[PDB]
Design a protein around this ligand. Structure first.
Ligand SMILES: CC#CCNS(=O)(=O)c1cc(S(N)(=O)=O)ccc1C(=O)O
Ligand SMILES: [Zn+2]
Length: 257
C-alpha cells in the first residue's frame, strides 16, 4: 500500500490517487517575498480551552492525537475562515535528520518537523462529509525547529513507547494542545489539499510564521517509532513528509507585514 519508501512513496501516489497531480495540492513552498499581505484577513481565533483529547494512535504513517469532536469544544475560527471548524486530531511529519521533516517549506528552508492540527467545518455535519467539500477542512500547520525543549510536548513524547508499531493505540486524555502553540499567531494561508492519500482538495491551510522549539531528545523519540506492525521487520518512522508541490494558479496570503 502507500507509504514513504522508494517503492511506495510520494512519487508513486498518483497511480492510485490521480488527484496527486491536481490543481491545489499540498504542501507548497512559501516564498516569503511573493506572499502578499492581506489587510482584510482577520486574526485567527484558536479556542482550545475545552478540548477533550481521547487517544493516541500509530496509524502506520504518523501518530494521531484524537479529540472528541461530537460537540463544539476545541474550535478554529476567524483568520481566512468563514464559520466554525472543530478540532478532530493532530499529528506531525518529521525527518531522519534535523535538516528535513517539514512538508511546507519557507523560501526552500525545511524545518525538522511540522505539526498539523486538523479541523472540519461544522456546516457539513461530519468529517466524512466535510472532506468532500472545497472548504471542508482547516489545517493549522506549525513548524518545529530543534533547540530548547517544548514542555507542552513532553506528555506526547513519553507515551510513544506504548504505541511503537502500526495499529497500537493508548488512552490519551486531558492533553492541552495550547501547549504546542508559538507566541505569535501570524500566518500564511492558501487553498490546498490533504498531504496524504486520498489527497483530497478540501483544505484551507493556515501555516504559522513562528516555529516552536523542541529538543533534540524530543524529536529523537519521534524517530524511534515504527511504520511496521508488531513482529514485522523494523522500519523506523522517519521522513514521513510529502515534498512541496507545484503552486499552480494560487496566491499565498500573509496576515502580517
Ligand atoms: C478521508 C480522509 C482523510 C484525511 N484524514 S485526516 O484529515 O485526519 C488527515 C490529514 C492529514 S494532513 N497532513 O493533510 O493534515 C494527514 C493525515 C490524516 C489522517 O487520516 O490521519
Ligand atoms: Zn499532516
Amino acid at each position: 500500500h502507500w507509504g514513504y519508501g522508494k517503492h511506495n512513496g510520494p512519487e508513486h501516489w498518483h497511480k492510485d490517487f490521480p488527484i496527486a497531480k491536481g490543481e491545489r495540492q499540498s504542501p507548497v513552498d512559501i516564498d516569503t517575498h511573493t506572499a502578499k499581505y492581506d489587510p482584510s484577513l482577520k486574526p485567527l481565533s484558536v479556542s482550545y480551552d475545552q478540548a477533550t483529547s481521547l487517544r493516541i494512535l500509530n496509524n502506520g504513517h504518523a501518530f494521531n492525537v484524537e479529540f472528541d469532536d461530537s460537540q463544539d469544544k476545541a474550535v478554529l475560527k476567524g483568520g481566512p475562515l468563514d464559520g466554525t471548524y472543530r478540532l478532530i486530531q493532530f499529528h506531525f511529519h518529521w525527518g531522519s535528520l534535523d535538516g528535513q521533516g517539514s512538508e511546507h517549506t519557507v523560501d526552500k528552508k525545511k524545518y525538522a518537523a511540522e505539526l498539523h492540527l486538523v479541523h472540519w467545518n461544522t456546516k457539513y455535519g461530519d468529517f466524512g462529509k466535510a472532506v468532500q467539500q472545497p472548504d471542508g477542512l482547516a489545517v493549522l500547520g506549525i513548524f518545529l525547529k530543534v533547540g530548547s525543549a517544548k514542555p507542552g510536548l513532553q506528555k506526547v513524547v513519553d507515551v510513544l513507547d506504548s504505541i511503537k508499531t502500526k495499529g497500537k493505540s493508548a488512552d490519551f486524555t486531558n492533553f492541552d494542545p495550547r501547549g504546542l502553540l508559538p507566541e505569535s499567531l501570524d500566518y500564511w494561508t492558501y487553498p490546498g489539499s490533504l498531504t496524504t492519500p486520498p489527497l483530497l482538495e478540501c483544505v484551507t491551510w493556515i501555516v504559522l510564521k513562528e516555529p516552536i522549539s523542541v529538543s533534540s531528545e524530543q524529536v529523537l523519540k519521534f524517530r524511534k517509532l515504527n511504520f511496521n506492525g508488531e513482529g514485522e521487520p523494523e522500519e523506523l518512522m522517519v521522513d514521513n513528509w510529502r515534498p512541496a508541490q507545484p503552486l499552480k494558479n494560487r496566491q499565498i496570503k500573509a496576515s502580517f507585514k
